[PDB]
Design a binder for these strands. Structure first.
Ligand SMILES: [K+]
Ligand SMILES: [K+]
Ligand SMILES: [K+]
Ligand SMILES: [K+]
Ligand SMILES: [K+]
Ligand SMILES: [K+]
Ligand SMILES: [K+]
Ligand SMILES: [K+]
Ligand SMILES: [K+]
Ligand SMILES: [K+]
Ligand SMILES: [K+]
Ligand SMILES: [K+]
Ligand SMILES: [K+]
Ligand SMILES: [K+]
Ligand SMILES: [K+]
Ligand SMILES: [K+]
Ligand SMILES: [Mg+2]
Ligand SMILES: [Mg+2]
Ligand SMILES: [Mg+2]
Ligand SMILES: [Mg+2]
Ligand SMILES: [Mg+2]
Ligand SMILES: [Mg+2]
Ligand SMILES: [Mg+2]
Ligand SMILES: [Mg+2]
Ligand SMILES: [Mg+2]
Ligand SMILES: [Mg+2]
Ligand SMILES: [Mg+2]
Ligand SMILES: [Mg+2]
Ligand SMILES: [Mg+2]
Ligand SMILES: [Mg+2]
Ligand SMILES: [Mg+2]
Ligand SMILES: [Mg+2]
Ligand SMILES: [Mg+2]
Ligand SMILES: [Mg+2]
Ligand SMILES: [Mg+2]
Ligand SMILES: [Mg+2]
Ligand SMILES: [Mg+2]
Ligand SMILES: [Mg+2]
Ligand SMILES: [Mg+2]
Ligand SMILES: [Mg+2]
Ligand SMILES: [Mg+2]
Ligand SMILES: [Mg+2]
Ligand SMILES: [Mg+2]
Ligand SMILES: [Mg+2]
Ligand SMILES: [Mg+2]
Ligand SMILES: [Mg+2]
Ligand SMILES: [Mg+2]
Ligand SMILES: [Mg+2]
Ligand SMILES: [Mg+2]
Ligand SMILES: [Mg+2]
Ligand SMILES: [Mg+2]
Ligand SMILES: [Mg+2]
Ligand SMILES: [Mg+2]
Ligand SMILES: [Mg+2]
Ligand SMILES: [Mg+2]
Ligand SMILES: [Mg+2]
Ligand SMILES: [Mg+2]
Lengths: 53, 235
RNA sequence: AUAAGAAUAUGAUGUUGGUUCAGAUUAAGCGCUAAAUAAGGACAUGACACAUGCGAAUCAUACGUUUAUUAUUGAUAAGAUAAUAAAUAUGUGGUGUAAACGUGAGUAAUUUUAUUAGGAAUUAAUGAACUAUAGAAUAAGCUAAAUACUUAAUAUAUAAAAAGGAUAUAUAAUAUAUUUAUCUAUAGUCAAGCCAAUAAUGGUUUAGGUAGUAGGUUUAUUAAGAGUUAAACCUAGCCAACGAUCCAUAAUCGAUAAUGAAAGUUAGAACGAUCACGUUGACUCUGAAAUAUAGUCAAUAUCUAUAAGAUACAGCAGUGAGGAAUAUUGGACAAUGAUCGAAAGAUUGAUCCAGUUACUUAUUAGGAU
RNA sequence: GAGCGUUAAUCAUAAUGGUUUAAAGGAUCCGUAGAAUGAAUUAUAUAUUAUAAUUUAGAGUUAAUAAAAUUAAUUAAAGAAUU
RNA sequence: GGAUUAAAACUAGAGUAGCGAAACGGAUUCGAUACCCGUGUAGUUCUAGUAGUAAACUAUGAAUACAAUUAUUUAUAUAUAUAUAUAUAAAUAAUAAAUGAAAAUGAAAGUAUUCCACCUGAAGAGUACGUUAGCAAUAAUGAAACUCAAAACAAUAGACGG
RNA sequence: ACAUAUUAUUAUCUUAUUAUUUAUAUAAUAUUUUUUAAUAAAUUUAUUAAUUUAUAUUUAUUUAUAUCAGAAAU
């Protein structure tokens, strides 16, 4: 018998799915939004570079 | 993984669900340039209270269970402590029975000796009446009684010789038979080995298959097993 | 891998044995002496007391407030409205100060340090503040007004939110567009809590110690285990001559410094890592995290405004004191960083430089005849 | 040598030691712990260790045979001499 | 940790011839709190205890493996043409080798292994203080400061010796 | 001996503050709630001040426990 209140087995290792990590962390913009603004254009470029990296 | 240690249970039954386990680890002592064993006693959780003092167990790290308890019993590698408890209980019953039997065999022996001390008749005197009545023809009722004191219904010269037999005589004949067997076994094997042809035949006669193709030790053992199967099984 | 001895006993000899010397070094002081330059250091002592000036501000594009001009209105000029250009940070608001800097008092470890390819309770509806993506941003009240605060609405058992401002254009205050902010969710990044194993000074002329003490069960509390805290009920344990308990002393350590052939020994100033503290003690609030250099009360000291007041230089410079002994009441935000701001920019005794001082290191300090 | 000296300190400079007679064998033995040390063969293992089986050279047990009359404790006696 | 542990000493009860701290006397001597003599108490003895100390010495902890000889005893065994002879151990003595400052050790003080105790200049000091134990005397444990460059052992050659 | 300073401890004494926990109010505020005046508007309704009613949030006093600190003892 293992101690009462304790888990008999060790917690399961968490294996990372790089496809899922990429999808949740650096997801692509869902729509091709209209970045007519100067600040919107700068942000779009920075987001694209950061996602590529 | 969780840190596991091997140790000997050194205390049990003093705390509820807790045992003390002695863990010895190997360390290097630079000062004396020697690999030493370092010892430490662990307070260990025993959920099932199965372990016993003297057992060899494996303890595994767990969550904090008390101020000083951080390990639990994970397996009984050797259960010498549990065996001690079982053998002690059995010994009490086993010894009581034997002592009772021996006490009854001592009182019985005492009674027989007391009974014999109540019979004034003595072996010498009784054997002097069975040898005078057998040489004179008189048959006083004492003889009939003597035929009950000893069970010797018939009074002949070959009945007093069987009333006075000493165990030593039997030992002397058993010893001669023992010596004969040993001497015969040795002479038989000694001769067999001297004659390889008679040896090869000997093995085949006793049921060996191609004894010729055998080693000295692999075949001398067969000869020894056979010579001791021709002088101890037939006798 | 790199390992040297010497002087001193004795009448003389051999040996034992201590003492001292030859080497290197310093967080050095002192005596005598002293040229320039470059670089590295500088209160180890009283966590003693401190005159004076500085070391934390910033935002006017959150809300208010104040001018000037022009136009319209006001049949006489007090005011109102809008545009434009300024002013206001002694009014309400936001962000910033849990860092950095300084110091080493406490701390010998239920707490601190170091280490491990350690662990679970198998750690919160925590994001602190950037990144990627998606969605949302509603109604009242209170204040003079609001991006203040309060109460509601709707948003992943379901719970739990919000905020507008600036600039254009079109409308008749509203709508779009741009720009900068607000809120929520998911992941990443940064970053937290808890536990084990092992190691960490001297004294036993400190030998017995312990009574929540050792263990079990249950509730409360927490994101979370556990006599961690609080409550209840049980068992009689737990530590200790391989040194318990107690006392004294001390911030710890390194791929740092010193020394040695090396194992080691020493230091812990300088460089870096960790811990603790910001006159002393406890407590509370906010918060993911604080017994916070905050707040509350008390203690000690000082001060002026005499108040249930303010201050506490272990921030920089500096002064008195103590001591053998350790420096300028300097310059600059040019560089690297940090905070605030949409930006323009503002602030920065962080920092960068210089000053003082042979404290250390290095170079030079005239060659041929 | 722009230092030199001196004081205060640190490291190094002999245990690749000793205890009849020079500092130092505990009065003696018994025996507990020892994180002290310790036989043989073979087979495994994760290996100078562990386990299992097996062995008798250390250490013991019981007899047999021979030998010896001491050392403890207790009780019972003797002797020369002395006053 | 335990047990045992000379002599002296102590606590009780017996004993007390001889011996004999002390004490009191006689001598010796310049003096004689001595050496010698006398009277001689405690003690020396026994029983029941306390205490755990000695130059308690081989000034040498215990165990195991091993190394060259001789002599002399002892023990066991063997043999005989019966009284010796031959073997294997122990003890003791003198040695080789080896070790050692040497004197010497000699089966260890040699060659090795294992475990325990103990030492780290002299003096202060086995003292002080504390603690534990004891009826007590005491026993165990056991420092530091100050001062010094000493201090000690074996051996050598002398000098000296009632 | 002892006179001092420092620290620690407590079956003791006093105790700021705080946390937790009691009891109380003709306590305050908001809402609800029962009525009652005054006032106002319109021609019943609203507002204000009271009373009744519960509810939540506070406040004052109060009970108990713990607590900085000081006192006494050691
Ligand atoms: K528990
Ligand atoms: K000299
Ligand atoms: K010397
Ligand atoms: K110097
Ligand atoms: K702004
Ligand atoms: K400073
Ligand atoms: K410190
Ligand atoms: K906007
Ligand atoms: K200690
Ligand atoms: K300094
Ligand atoms: K700057
Ligand atoms: K010696
Ligand atoms: K002992
Ligand atoms: K006498
Ligand atoms: K002797
Ligand atoms: K010994
Ligand atoms: Mg020197
Ligand atoms: Mg400089
Ligand atoms: Mg200082
Ligand atoms: Mg404005
Ligand atoms: Mg303001
Ligand atoms: Mg800080
Ligand atoms: Mg809104
Ligand atoms: Mg509003
Ligand atoms: Mg708000
Ligand atoms: Mg709300
Ligand atoms: Mg003392
Ligand atoms: Mg619990
Ligand atoms: Mg506790
Ligand atoms: Mg309790
Ligand atoms: Mg300190
Ligand atoms: Mg160190
Ligand atoms: Mg240190
Ligand atoms: Mg410094
Ligand atoms: Mg603090
Ligand atoms: Mg403080
Ligand atoms: Mg504070
Ligand atoms: Mg200060
Ligand atoms: Mg300063
Ligand atoms: Mg001075
Ligand atoms: Mg400045
Ligand atoms: Mg130089
Ligand atoms: Mg050395
Ligand atoms: Mg020795
Ligand atoms: Mg001895
Ligand atoms: Mg001795
Ligand atoms: Mg034997
Ligand atoms: Mg007597
Ligand atoms: Mg006399
Ligand atoms: Mg005794
Ligand atoms: Mg003595
Ligand atoms: Mg002695
Ligand atoms: Mg003797
Ligand atoms: Mg023995
Ligand atoms: Mg003594
Ligand atoms: Mg001599
Ligand atoms: Mg207190």
């Amino acid at each position: 018998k293992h101690p009462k209140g304790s888990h008999r087995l060790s917690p399961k290792v968490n294996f990372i799915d790089v496809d899922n990590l990429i999808a949740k962390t650096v997801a692509e913009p869902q729509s091709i939004k209209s970045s007519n603004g100067s600040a919107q254009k700068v942000r779009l470029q920075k987001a694209e570079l950061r996602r590529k990296f | 993984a969780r840190q596991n240690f091997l140790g000997l249970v050194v205390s049990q039954g003093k705390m509820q669900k807790t045992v003390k386990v002695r863990v010895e680890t190997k360390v290097f002592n630079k000062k004396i340039n020697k690999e030493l064993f370092h010892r430490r006693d662990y307070l260990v959780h025993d959920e099932g209270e199965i372990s016993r003092e003297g057992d060899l167990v494996r303890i595994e790290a767990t969550r904090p269970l008390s101020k000083r308890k951080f390990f639990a019993i994970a397996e009984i590698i050797r259960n010498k402590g549990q065996q001690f408890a079982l053998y002690e209980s059995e010994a009490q019953l086993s010894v009581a029975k034997e002592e009772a039997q021996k006490a009854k065999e001592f009182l019985d022996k005492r009674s027989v000796r007391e009974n014999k001390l109540n019979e004034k008749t003595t072996l010498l005197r009784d054997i002097r009446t069975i040898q005078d009545a057998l040489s004179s023809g008189s048959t006083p009722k004492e003889l009939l009684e003597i035929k009950q004191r000893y069970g010797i219904q018939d009074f002949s010269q070959e009945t007093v010789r069987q009333l006075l037999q000493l165990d030593i005589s039997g030992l002397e004949v058993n010893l001669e038979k023992q010596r004969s067997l040993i001497d015969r076994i040795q002479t038989r094997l000694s001769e067999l080995l001297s004659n390889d042809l008679k040896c090869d035949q000997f093995l085949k006669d006793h049921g060996v298959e191609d004894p010729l193709t055998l080693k000295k030790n692999i075949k001398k053992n067969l000869l020894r097993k056979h010579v001791m199967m021709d002088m101890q099984q037939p006798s």
